[PDB]
Symmetry: none
Subunit: 63 residues, 6 copies
């Protein structure tokens, strides 16, 4: 690897605008996962067997 | 690998605009996964057997 | 690895604007995970087997 | 550029919930008026002398 | 640029919840007016002499 | 730039909750007016001489 004057931009998130508006919201949850907001994940490298990069609303029940 | 004056842009997310508006919302959840918001994942490399990169509303029940 | 005058930007998050507005919100939760706010995760490297990078609303029940 | 117009809610009614359970009700009316249920009126304009907008359980015995 | 207009709620009614359970109610009315339930009126304008906007349980015996 | 307009709530009613449980109620009315339930009135303007905006449990016996 060798850069010379290069404007590299690996693995980013930007300029994310959300104008939300809810007059009413009701969330009932039992055991599970609920996600209703803004999420932003930015990773460059994730190495590993069995791993999980960037879960969101994840439900895992193994044996 | 060798860059010279190159404006590389690997694995990004940008300029994501969401104008949402909900007069009423009702989420009932039992055990499962619900996702109702904005999500933005940006990864460059994910190595590994059995892995999971960028799940969203994922339900895993193995044996 | 060798950089020379390069403006590298590995694994970042920026310029994330959220204008939210909720007249009413009701969250009932039993055992599970609920996420309703703004989240921003930025990692460069996550190594390891079985690991979890950047969970959000994660429910894990293994044996 | 992206434009989103101006909402307006001149004279509305919404989100009226009434639950009843194991409810005994006995009513005896003689010449009068009785109201026992849910009602919702939404008008924008009512004009005129002597008018009666949105009566409910009204009795009117003039001479 | 991104524009979001100006909301307005001139004369509304919302989010009215009434639960009842194991409720005995006996009513006897004679010539009068009785109101025992949920009501919701939303008007923007009412004009005129002698007008009666949004009566409820009203009795009117003039001479 | 991002603009968000000016909200306005001229004359509204919201979020009215009433729970009742194991409630005995006996009512006897004779010629009069009785009100025993939930009410919600939301007007923006009422004009005119002699007007009666938003009566409730009103009795009017003139000569």
């Amino acid at each position: 690897v060798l850069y010379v004057g290069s404007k590299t931009k690996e693995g980013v998130v930007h300029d994310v605008t959300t104008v939300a508006e809810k007059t009413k919201e009701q969330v009932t949850n039992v055991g599970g996962a609920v996600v209703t907001g803004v999420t932003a994940v930015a990773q460059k490298t994730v190495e590993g067997a069995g791993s999980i990069a960037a879960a969101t609303g994840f439900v895992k029940k193994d044996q």
